[PDB]
RNA sequence: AAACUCCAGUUGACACAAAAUAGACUACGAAAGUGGCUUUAACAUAUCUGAACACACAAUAGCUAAGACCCAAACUGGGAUUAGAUACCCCACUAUGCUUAGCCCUAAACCUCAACAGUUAAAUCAACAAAACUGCUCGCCAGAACACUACGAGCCACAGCUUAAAACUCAAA
């Protein structure tokens, strides 16, 4: 057949594998890159966490914690941990336009990961809570 | 006027779904309503998660109930729907045939605006 | 389908409350501004950042890390050659739109007319 | 453009004289400065393309009555 | 929260390539207006200064939709010289 | 830096708050103002004009009383910057913003361009801005400043609002 960038619904049966797993059984990879932090934690499909990283669990400080190589720190140290739980295959689901949006996706791959779908669920309100005032800085 | 009942049923049995349906048009009727017609829409999946009556729920039934009514049975019958609790979800709007479309002539261009600035040496 | 501009201004015909409120009128220069310039991508990072972890595990010898330092070094060779193919030929290449100062010598020849001769 | 060499060779031909090209401005407003004193200007002035290539009146229609010179356009 | 999980902004990866991934999912968010929506719901825009902006946006589309209509409009003017030496 | 560490992330349950996209639309309403869904009631006038004060409305802020509370947030407290910092930057929190019932009656309430009817000809028109005019009517205005003042009157307003001078002074604004 062809290939189609929608995921595979999970009601109906489509011939789309991993290892011999659904795309439902397959783990996540929740990112949430902030602006000054970026956590990453892997779970299953029954919602079980198996690895947790961040830039601050990897020995960063204040603002060095907001860049793109402590994000891609954080994703050897998650993929690093998950790997010897048998996860080889994962879904990313990002969350955030932070500096580590796309650089802890990298760190994820470079732990032995393999990235089968790119989420986001970055939080959209349709008008909900006022932020705070602007800034003069 | 006349009415249509977008009424959304809790998945149940066709016993169950019956009753409820007869329990729902027989208040209509009490409150001077004459009812023309009951459509089903099938039972489908929900778009998302409706929490009704103490309860999660991810499927149900459709059904719609045009009928005539008086304008003040429409608030009393969004009481009643409100405490049944094999009633998922159930709105009330007006009829969308009571509506006559409007025949249309097609697209009419708009040409752009003119003597908008004095036409003047800047 | 350009947007429309009846009863945006505020008029003496137009009762309505102005929708638009331009600081500079609405009425076409005979000019396009300058293309301005781009942040630029920062290249053999990948290379530079196995490189410099090489390294740290090795204590800051360069006869185990051999094989990426030539990945940073050969990388650094490209990205040079490139920067400098880019500069020039996309001034003297023409592809896809024109430069404001050949694009501006076309609008001077049917420059807008505001006013009545 | 299209019609300059046509228009040089007629005014040969006719014994008369053509300006195709940049009008200069002051040929007739300020001849005596460019050509001389003793310059006699043109007694007829015959516009076949009475706008240049901007789509604007050509100057010498207005230079020509400044001097007035009779006009004769297109 | 009480929609379907994965339909949303989801991207699947073709033959590991999740550079093409994220840039076309960076595509659809820009397409749809998400990623300017995010970057103005940091702080608080008032409705006067949202108001500003949301007027030089619809002016600017006005002028850069004309010029650009001019511009492919003589396009057709930019060969070479026909009359060359009159 | 301080702060927090019954903190953070996933999942699930869960609002008297606020209403992405659509909206490149240009609508409603006297204006203020109005952009989530449904329903009910419902949007003056068969000449025009017509009020600081009559009659009725009027953003935000604010008072009084009783409730609510996600977030934001004057004040205040803490941290930092600084010659200093009663500020800009960070954190926390309150009055307040919300509902109900009364009050207050202000705005760069400015599309600074009155209402109605009409014209595009003639001298187009100081300038700029949003081309220039005609008829009719109401309202207002006659150097600057003193003065969104003082006094007086009126007002549920008591550090208030409306109306609103003069003297001294300058030869400019
Ligand atoms: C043409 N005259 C201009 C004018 O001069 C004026 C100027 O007049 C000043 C008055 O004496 C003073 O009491 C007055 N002071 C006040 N407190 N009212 C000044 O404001 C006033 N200047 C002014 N209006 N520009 O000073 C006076 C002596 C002057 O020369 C009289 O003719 O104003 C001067 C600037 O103040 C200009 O330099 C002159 O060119
Ligand atoms: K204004
Ligand atoms: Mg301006
Ligand atoms: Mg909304
Ligand atoms: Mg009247
Ligand atoms: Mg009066
Ligand atoms: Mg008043
Ligand atoms: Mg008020
Ligand atoms: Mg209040
Ligand atoms: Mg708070
Ligand atoms: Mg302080
Ligand atoms: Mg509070
Ligand atoms: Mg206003
Ligand atoms: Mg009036
Ligand atoms: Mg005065
Ligand atoms: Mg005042
Ligand atoms: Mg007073
Ligand atoms: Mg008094």
Redesign the interface.
């Known amino acids: 057949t062809k290939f189609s960038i929608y995921p595979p619904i999970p009601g109906e049966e489509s011939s789309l594998r991993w290892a011999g797993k659904k795309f439902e059984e397959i783990p996540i990879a929740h990112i949430k890159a902030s602006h000054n932090n970026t956590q990453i934690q892997v779970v299953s499909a029954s919602n079980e966490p198996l690895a947790f990283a961040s830039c601050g669990t990897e020995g960063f400080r204040n603002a060095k914690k907001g860049t793109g190589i402590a994000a891609q720190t954080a994703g050897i140290a998650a993929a690093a941990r998950a790997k010897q739980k048998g996860v080889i295959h994962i879904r990313v689901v990002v969350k955030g336009l932070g500096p580590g949006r796309l650089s802890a996706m990298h760190g994820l791959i470079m732990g032995g990961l393999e990235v089968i779908s790119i989420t986001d669920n970055t939080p959209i309100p349709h008008n909900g809570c006022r932020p705070r005032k602007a800034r003069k800085l | 006027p006349r009415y249509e009942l977008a009424l959304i049923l809790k998945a149940m049995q066709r016993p169950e779904t019956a009753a409820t349906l007869k329990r729902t048009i027989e208040a209509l009727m009490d409150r001077g309503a004459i009812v023309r017609d009951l459509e089903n829409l099938g039972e489908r999946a929900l778009p998302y998660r409706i929490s009704a009556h103490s309860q999660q729920h991810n499927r149900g039934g459709y059904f719609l109930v045009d009928f005539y009514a008086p304008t003040a049975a429409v608030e009393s019958m969004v009481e009643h729907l409100s405490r049944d609790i094999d009633v998922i979800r159930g709105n009330i709007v007006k009829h969308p045939l009571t509506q006559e479309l409007k025949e249309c002539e097609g697209i009419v261009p708009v040409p752009l605006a003119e003597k908008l600035y004095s036409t003047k040496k800047r | 389908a350009?947007?429309?501009?009846?009863g945006?201004?505020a008029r003496f015909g137009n009762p309505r409350k102005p929708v638009?409120?331009?600081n500079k009128?609405?009425?076409?220069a005979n000019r396009?501004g300058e293309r301005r310039r781009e942040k630029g991508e920062a290249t053999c990072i990948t290379e530079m950042?196995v490189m410099m972890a090489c390294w740290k595990q090795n204590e800051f010898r360069d006869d185990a890390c051999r094989k990426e330092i030539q990945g940073f070094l050969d990388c650094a060779a490209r990205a040079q050659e490139a920067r400098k193919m880019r500069s020039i030929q996309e001034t003297l290449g023409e592809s896809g739109s024109?430069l404001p100062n050949k694009?501006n010598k076309?609008?001077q020849?049917?420059?807008n007319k505001?006013?009545?001769? | 453009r299209q019609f300059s060499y046509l228009i040089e060779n007629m005014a040969r031909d006719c014994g008369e004289y053509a300006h195709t090209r940049y009008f200069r401005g002051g040929m007739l407003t300020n001849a005596r400065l460019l050509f001389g004193p003793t310059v006699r200007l043109p007694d007829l002035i015959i516009f076949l393309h009475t706008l240049n290539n901007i789509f604007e009146p050509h100057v010498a229609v207005r230079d020509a009555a400044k001097m007035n010179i009779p006009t004769v356009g297109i | 929260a009480k929609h379907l999980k994965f339909i949303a902004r989801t991207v699947m990866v073709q033959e590991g390539n999740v550079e093409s991934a994220y840039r076309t999912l960076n595509r659809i968010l820009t397409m749809d207006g998400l990623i300017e929506d995010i970057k103005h719901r940091r702080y608080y825009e008032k409705p006067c200064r949202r108001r500003q902006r949301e007027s030089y946006e619809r002016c600017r589309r006005i002028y850069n939709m004309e010029m650009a209509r001019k511009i492919n409009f003589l396009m057709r003017k930019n060969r070479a010289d026909p009359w060359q030496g009159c």
């Open positions: 350009t947007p429309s501009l009846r945006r201004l638009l409120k331009p009128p609405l009425i076409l396009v950042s024109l694009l076309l609008l020849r049917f420059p505001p006013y009545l001769s």
